[PDB]
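Q: For a teaching handout, I want to show students what a protein-ligand complex looks like in token form. Below are the inputs, and the small molecule is calcium ion. Please produce the holo structure.
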Amino acid sequence: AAQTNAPWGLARISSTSPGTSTYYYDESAGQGSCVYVIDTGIEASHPEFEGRAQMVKTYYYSSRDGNGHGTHCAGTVGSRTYGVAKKTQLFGVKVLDDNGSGQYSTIIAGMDFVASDKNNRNCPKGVVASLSLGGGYSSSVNSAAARLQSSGVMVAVAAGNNNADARNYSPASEPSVCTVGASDRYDRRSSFSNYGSVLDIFGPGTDILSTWIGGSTRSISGTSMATPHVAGLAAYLMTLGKTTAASACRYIADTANKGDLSNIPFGTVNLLAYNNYQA
Ligand SMILES: [Ca+2]
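A: Here is the structure, written as tokens, with calcium ion included.
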């Protein structure tokens, strides 16, 4: 399948060179996989989700996304026009309030919730969790991410936006999950992206068009926007049978475009997520 005039980040993950505008992907498109988006919520009624999104848990007064961030990230995972895995099932867990903030105890509870809830859902091709959030180092937050991964869920987390070593941030610094940095459309490390030895992979993160609340769209930037490209890619590859939740981060790194990014400090991987699609 081919989507013409795609957002640049989708085109980039299906190309060995920057500057293309078509997203090439297998028609299976993540069908049969499930992705939990742990964030401010998802506007499940947005036409771009085609009925494939639902909220399953909130830690606040409402399950509505009053912010937009969670709806944007979910759109990059799996909306029709803006998504990597266009036929996946999306589940929303609202651990952040409508200002985008949340306490670590709530974020931990939401991770433990997903590890249990996936046993009630029909996800025959596997389960992914996308965490476009973080803060300062916490061993308890890292431990919760490690538990979620151990339970059989592919966990992708944002590296953070401080132009610093991600070893000082959580859950970015948990080695056993998939920690995602951001790049821009000229194959530079995004100027805000964290770096360091704990990063596993880069994905598109600057000027990313996706869904927004009120049935709208907008473009924003962050490692929050790179993470759902990798979460969606994992769901897509698990549906194709190429990898499993336990090994998907390693598989994505092994099959990435290697050495193409600029402004990568010594000691950080130079690997850009790539779907390897051949018609
Ligand atoms: Ca890792």
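A: Two things your students might notice: The CA atoms of residues 23 and 274 lie 11 Å apart. Residues 175, 177-179, 200, 249 surround calcium ion (CB under 6 Å).
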